Ligand binder design. Structure first.
Ligand SMILES: Cc1cc2nc3c(=O)[nH]c(=O)nc-3n(C[C@H](O)[C@H](O)[C@H](O)COP(=O)(O)OP(=O)(O)OC[C@H]3O[C@@H](n4cnc5c(N)ncnc54)[C@H](O)[C@@H]3O)c2cc1C
Ligand SMILES: Cc1cc2nc3c(=O)[nH]c(=O)nc-3n(C[C@H](O)[C@H](O)[C@H](O)COP(=O)(O)OP(=O)(O)OC[C@H]3O[C@@H](n4cnc5c(N)ncnc54)[C@H](O)[C@@H]3O)c2cc1C
Ligand SMILES: O=C1Oc2ccccc2C(=O)[C@@H]1C[C@H]1C(=O)Oc2ccccc2C1=O
Ligand SMILES: O=C1Oc2ccccc2C(=O)[C@@H]1C[C@H]1C(=O)Oc2ccccc2C1=O
Lengths: 222, 222
């Protein structure tokens, strides 16, 4: 009886990304998983870090520094409700899935802001406990990414360069940094070129992988 | 009589980042440059792409697709005022400076959202004209980044890996993609460990580089 969290970053319910979230949620429930969601757009999630992330009086309001202030707020329990609610989803989660379209070679701003506001010090990382020693080391995370471009465009010979180098600041810099055992990215290329029956098989293949996602071998980080 | 645009992504006017923007603006004006700013936080810039980026009736409102809809809106002149105002700053700019603290190994969400909402198709790139053939090929861009970590942490032997690999999706994936001649990043490491007199020299060295920034040799992209 494991618990999964699906973070979705797409504005449209009619999108293929939304379809992929639905497929993920259905396959996991069918396998006994408990499924919680963070549809950032449906939540109208605020992705901008500010002093309003901390309730009540600050330590140094004249010279506000987000890192020091936010960590203190997490420890003492003075973070804003929307952040706290998200941190609670993560605390309960065994597996976290990030479903998003690749945007300017990375995560959409609303997901980037989610990381910035939710992954507070002490909670998601400490200067003393990161990577293998990270707080999330008992959890697994996976990116499911849809692109406009082709797999070959995102290779060494392609115009964009290798995808693994592109995803490094997310997979390593964010996920592994916080301790996550990162699983292999689900990459869906050339969305606009994919006919209807192929898109269906894409959804079916994704649900198929999720049937045994937990048994997978994580990525290796030196 | 050249024109410069400074995009700043920091909430605090008391921040060292704000100080660096002020230093940049002052050194360029002293050298005859015209200086325009985009203080994203002071502007309360909206960093979330949505159908509200397009005014009036859409082509396909039942199945909204941002890329197709936004490009059409740029061509026909139906983009939201805040986006248009930003695109006009870029059109007039010879040099664009991005001043921001490194956040989770990249740009803050509000700057990421700025790229996503402002860099619309046809305006900032086309599938047929990118990189060297990009629309911004007559312009130069530079990142000025402040970090909590050290230069050595961001090396091959460091725990975080090489900085140039970290900055690749920004420098290449965004700036060069749109045609910019990208200049060498101004990297200010270990902010929290830097004493007052050293911070002053940091500001002075930055203004010094800007005295002859336009004559610099751009980065090489294969
Ligand atoms: C700001 C921005 C930056 C971008 N940057 C990049 C980049 O750097 N690199 C890159 O490669 N691409 C980039 N893109 C392109 C982007 O990655 C693709 O547009 C995106 O991945 C497509 O995903 P989608 O969910 O919007 O597909 P949609 O266009 O919403 O859907 C595609 C098809 O799937 C169908 N569909 C929906 N639901 C179902 C279902 N249940 N079953 C079967 N079919 C269904 C739809 O009807 C549609 O025909 C960018 C786009 C934007 C807006
Ligand atoms: C969400 C988030 C994610 C982050 N991710 C990363 C990461 O991945 N890697 C990493 O290395 N770091 C990271 N950091 C740390 C961050 O990069 C640093 O906190 C930031 O670069 C410091 O910049 P600042 O402008 O806030 O400095 P501040 O702390 O605001 O200023 C530092 C000093 O400069 C002084 N100062 C201000 N104005 C002047 C002036 N005119 N003259 C002289 N001195 C002045 C101030 O008084 C202060 O003492 C992250 C921080 C956050 C909040
Ligand atoms: O769909 C494509 O068509 C192409 C045809 C010829 C050469 C290259 C490309 C591409 O890069 C991709 C995706 C293309 C991309 O990779 O970068 C982007 C940045 C912002 C917004 C949208 C996108 C894309 O859809
Ligand atoms: O200041 C630091 O102290 C350290 C001491 C020992 C080992 C590593 C580090 C660091 O990574 C940096 C910066 C540190 C970092 O690199 O990643 C972050 C992610 C989110 C928020 C803030 C930060 C940081 O300030």
């Amino acid at each position: 009886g494991r618990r999964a969290l699906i973070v979705l970053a797409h504005s449209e319910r009619t999108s293929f990304n939304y379809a992929m979230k639905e497929a993920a949620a259905a396959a996991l429930k069918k396998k006994g998983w408990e499924v919680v969601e963070s549809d950032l757009y449906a939540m109208n999630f605020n992705p901008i870090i500010s002093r309003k992330d901390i309730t009540g009086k600050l330590k140094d309001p004249a010279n506000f520094q987000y890192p020091a202030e936010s960590v203190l707020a997490y420890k003492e329990g003075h973070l804003s409700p929307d952040i706290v609610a998200e941190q609670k989803k993560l605390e309960a989660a065994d597996l976290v899935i990030f479903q998003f379209p690749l945007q300017w070679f990375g995560v959409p701003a609303i997901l980037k802001g989610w990381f910035e506001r939710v992954f507070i010090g002490e909670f998601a990382y400490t200067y003393a406990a990161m990577y293998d020693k990270g707080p999330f080391r008992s959890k697994k995370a996976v990116l499911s990414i849809t692109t406009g471009g082709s797999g070959s465009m995102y290779s060494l010979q392609g115009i964009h360069g290798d995808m693994n180098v592109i995803l490094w600041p997310i997979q390593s810099g964010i996920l592994h940094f916080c301790g996550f055992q990162v699983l292999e990215s689900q990459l869906t290329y050339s969305i606009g070129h994919t006919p209807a029956d192929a898109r269906i098989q894409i959804l079916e293949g994704w649900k198929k992988r999720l049937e045994n996602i937990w048994d997978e071998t994580p990525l290796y980080f030196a």
